[PDB]
């Protein structure tokens, strides 16, 4: 089925890079927050958005001899104000589909004059 | 308006106390996650649930000479499978309506044989 991770009107201002921080529309940290969906299923994440281009981040912080992963992905495709990200695209960027060490999931804008607004985020299982 | 923080079918098993951990249906850590709603508005949180009694936690960890706040609140009321929590009830349990030091928001079950299932969490502004 379909899991709503957010619905409303979340605005993010971000007019240029080069500042230090990169603000988000939505974030999860799996080691610290009970999960709203199960990463082990085959899933897609769909985001209704406008105002800026959008990326999805899966990240693992550096630990020991294992490097930081910063899996920044563009949509698998966009259609009708909606970006679709798939698990198999995410796994290719993450280097595997093993999320047992995943530290961070973030939805972020690219720079724009107007800011990005997200109105809905859903996880859908395709298994 | 109304902001959907979650909708789906989130099950939490928790049959007794005395273990060390207390699992959650939903958690946010405001210092670390961009917020889906604005704590400064007058709001209520409404949760559609069944299977166990439910509480809402607002917490601040101990820092310096300021104590840990563990604002565990029962619903302001329940009606038709839905618990309602209000900002003014939360502020009374938290000791103020100043959320500038809020570390944690959690929705948790009390012990039950069957576990709790949450199907929807919404923040509504009443300002």
Nearest residue of chain B to residue A12 (CA atoms):
B34
- The token duo for A123 is 């996880």
Under DSSP, is residue A87 helix (H, G, I), strand (E, B) or coil?
helix
Q: How far is CA B16 from CA A47, A75, B5, B117, in A?
A: 38, 44, 27, 16
The experimental method is X-ray
Distance of CA A13 to the CA centre of its chain: 17
Which residues, 6+ apart, have CB-to-CB distance to A89 below 8 Å? Answer: A73, A76
What b/e readout covers A34-51, taking b as 16+ CB neighbours within 10 angstroms? bebbebeeebbbbbbbeb
Q: Say how far apart CA B47 and CA B81 lie, in whole Å.
A: 8
Q: Say how far apart CA A62 and CA A73 lie, in whole Å.
A: 19
Contact A101, A31 (CB under 8 A): no
A119: region left, alpha or beta (phi > 0 left; psi from -120 to 50 alpha): alpha
Q: Say how far apart CA B57 and CA B78 lie, in whole Å.
A: 17
Cβ count near B72 (within 10 Å): 12
Contact A60, A102 (CB under 8 A): yes
Q: Give ∠ CA B99-B119-B71 in degrees, rounded to 5.
A: 25
A13: region left, alpha or beta (phi > 0 left; psi from -120 to 50 alpha): beta
Q: DSSP string spanning A16-64?
A: -S-SS----SEEE-TTTS--SS-TTS-EEEEEEEESS-EEEEEEE--BT
Q: Say how far apart CA B35 and CA B55 lie, in whole Å.
A: 20
Q: Say how far apart CA B8 and CA A123 lie, in whole Å.
A: 10
Three-state SS for chain B is: CEEEEEEEEEEECCCCCCCCCCCCCEEECCCCCCCCCCCCCCEEEEEEEECCCEEEEEEECCECCECCEEEEECCCEEECCEEEEEHHHHHHHHCCCCCCCCCEEEEEECCCCCCEEEEEEEEEECC
CA distance A64 to chain B (A): 23
- The token duo for B26 is 């939903």
Q: DSSP string spanning A91-122?
A: HHHHTSS--TT--EEEEEEPP-SS-EEEEEEE
Eight-class DSSP state of A66: B
Q: Which one of B2, B34, B35, B57 makes the best mutation probe of the A interface by having the most chain A beta carbons within 10 Å?
A: B34
A36: nearest CB among B6, B32, B33: B6
Q: Say how far apart CA A125 and CA A44 lie, in whole Å.
A: 6
Q: Which one of A2, A3, A7 makes the best mutation probe of the B interface by having the most chain B beta carbons within 10 Å?
A: A7
Residue with tokens 């679709």: A84
Taking an 8 Å Cβ-Cβ cutoff, which residues of chain B contact chain A? 1-10, 12, 23-29, 32-34, 36-37
Could you tell me the domains of chain A? 1-127 (2.60.120.1070)
Residue whose C-alpha is closest to residue A22's, from A113, A123, A126, A111: A111
Q: What is the resolution in angstroms? A: 1.2
What b/e readout covers B34-50, taking b as 16+ CB neighbours within 10 angstroms? bebbebeeebbbbbbbe
Q: How far is CA A5 from CA A36, A46, B33, B95, in A?
A: 7, 10, 14, 30
A92: region left, alpha or beta (phi > 0 left; psi from -120 to 50 alpha): alpha
Residue whose C-alpha is closest to residue B108's, from B45, B23, B19: B23
């Amino acid at each position: 089925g379909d899991i709503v991770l957010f619905s409303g009107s979340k605005h993010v201002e971000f007019t240029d890079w080069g500042g230090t921080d990169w603000p988000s529309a939505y974030e999860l940290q799996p080691p610290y927050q009970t999960m709203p969906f199960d990463l082990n299923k085959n899933f897609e994440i769909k985001v209704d958005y406008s105002g800026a281009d959008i990326v999805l981040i899966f990240a693992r912080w550096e630990h020991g001899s294992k490097p930081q992963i910063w899996a920044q992905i563009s949509p698998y495709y966009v259609v009708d104000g909606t970006a679709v990200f798939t698990k198999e695209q995410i796994a290719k960027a993450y280097g595997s589909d093993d999320f047992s060490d995943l530290d961070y999931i973030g939805v972020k804008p690219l720079p724009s004059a107007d800011g990005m607004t997200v109105t809905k985020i859903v996880a859908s299982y395709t298994s």
